[PDB]
Amino acid sequence: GSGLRQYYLSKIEELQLIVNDKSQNLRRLQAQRNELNAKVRLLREELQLLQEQGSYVGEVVRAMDKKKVLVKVHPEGKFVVDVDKNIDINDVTPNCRVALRNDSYTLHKILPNKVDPLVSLMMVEKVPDSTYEMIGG
């Protein structure tokens, strides 16, 4: 005992397929727009970011209490510096390379470790590497 109930359901299900298809297509395009929008937004913010003063490069002598670290800025001797809240004091190992902020000199990043002094020493000595196969008699 239904009227156009079948006709309505046919109409509604017809629109649902187009709506679901278009909604899926729109989500594809929105992500494409967002990715391009993020690229533009990051590009404009980069110009302000590049004007932020660079960080010093120092060498950790030893860690101290209260998150204090004794460093040696490359031309400017020794300093006692803070540690950024995002850097663990336990990772600050002696003779490590760290980045210090421009004004506060705060330890804010552990740079990749420099050449080991022994490796540096053995680089100038340059003893030829040898194996048992290249020894005769």
Partner 1 sequence: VRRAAVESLGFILFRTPEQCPSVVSLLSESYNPHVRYGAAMALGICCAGTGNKEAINLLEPMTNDPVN
Partner 2 sequence: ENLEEEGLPKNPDLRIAQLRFLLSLPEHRGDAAVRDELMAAVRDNNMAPYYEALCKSLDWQIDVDLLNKMKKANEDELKRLDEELEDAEKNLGESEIRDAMMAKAEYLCRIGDKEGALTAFRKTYDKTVALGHRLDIVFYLLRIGLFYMDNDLITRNTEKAKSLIEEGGDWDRRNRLKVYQGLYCVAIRDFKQAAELFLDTVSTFTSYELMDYKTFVTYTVYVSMIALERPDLREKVIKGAEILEVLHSLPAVRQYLFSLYECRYSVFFQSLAVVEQEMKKDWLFAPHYRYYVREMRIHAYSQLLESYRSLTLGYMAEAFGVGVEFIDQELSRFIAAGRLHCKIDKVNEIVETNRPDSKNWQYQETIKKGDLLLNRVQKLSRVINM
Partner 3 sequence: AAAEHSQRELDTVTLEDIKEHVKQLEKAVSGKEPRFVLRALRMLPSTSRRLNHYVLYKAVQGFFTSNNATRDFLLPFLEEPMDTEADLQFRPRTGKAASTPLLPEVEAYLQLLVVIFMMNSKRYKEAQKISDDLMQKISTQNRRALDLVAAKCYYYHARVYEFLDKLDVVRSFLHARLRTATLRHDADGQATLLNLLLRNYLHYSLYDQAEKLVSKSVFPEQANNNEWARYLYYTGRIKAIQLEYSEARRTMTNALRKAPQHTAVGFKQTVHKLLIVVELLLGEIPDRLQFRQPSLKRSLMPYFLLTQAVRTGNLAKFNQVLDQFGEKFQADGTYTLIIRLRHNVIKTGVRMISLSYSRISLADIAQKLQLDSPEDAEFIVAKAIRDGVIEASINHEKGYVQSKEMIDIYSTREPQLAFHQRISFCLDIHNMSVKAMRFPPKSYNKDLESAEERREREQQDLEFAKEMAE
- Helical (H) or strand (E) element with 79: strand 77-81
Dmax over Cα atoms in the chain, in whole Å? 107
For residues 81 and 106, the answer to whether their CB atoms sit within 8 Å is yes
Residue nearer to partner 1 on the CB measure, 17 or 43: 43
* Shortest spacing between CB 136 and partner 2, in angstroms: 13
Footprint of partner 3 (CB under 8 A): 9-10, 13-14, 17, 27-28, 31-32, 34-35, 37-38, 41-42, 45, 49, 52, 103
Residue from the set 11, 22, 27, 41 that interacts with partner 1 by CB under 8 A: 41
* Shortest spacing between CB 45 and partner 1, in angstroms: 8
Q: How far apart are CA 100 and CA 73, in angstroms?
A: 9
Residue nearer to partner 2 on the CB measure, 13 or 129: 129
The token pair that represents 9 in the structure block: 């359901």
* Shortest spacing between CB 121 and partner 3, in angstroms: 41
Q: For residue 61, which amino acid is it?
A: V
Residue nearer to partner 3 on the CB measure, 103 or 125: 103
Residue nearer to partner 3 on the CB measure, 87 or 96: 87
From the list 79, 74, 61, 69, the residue with the least C-alpha distance to 108 is 69
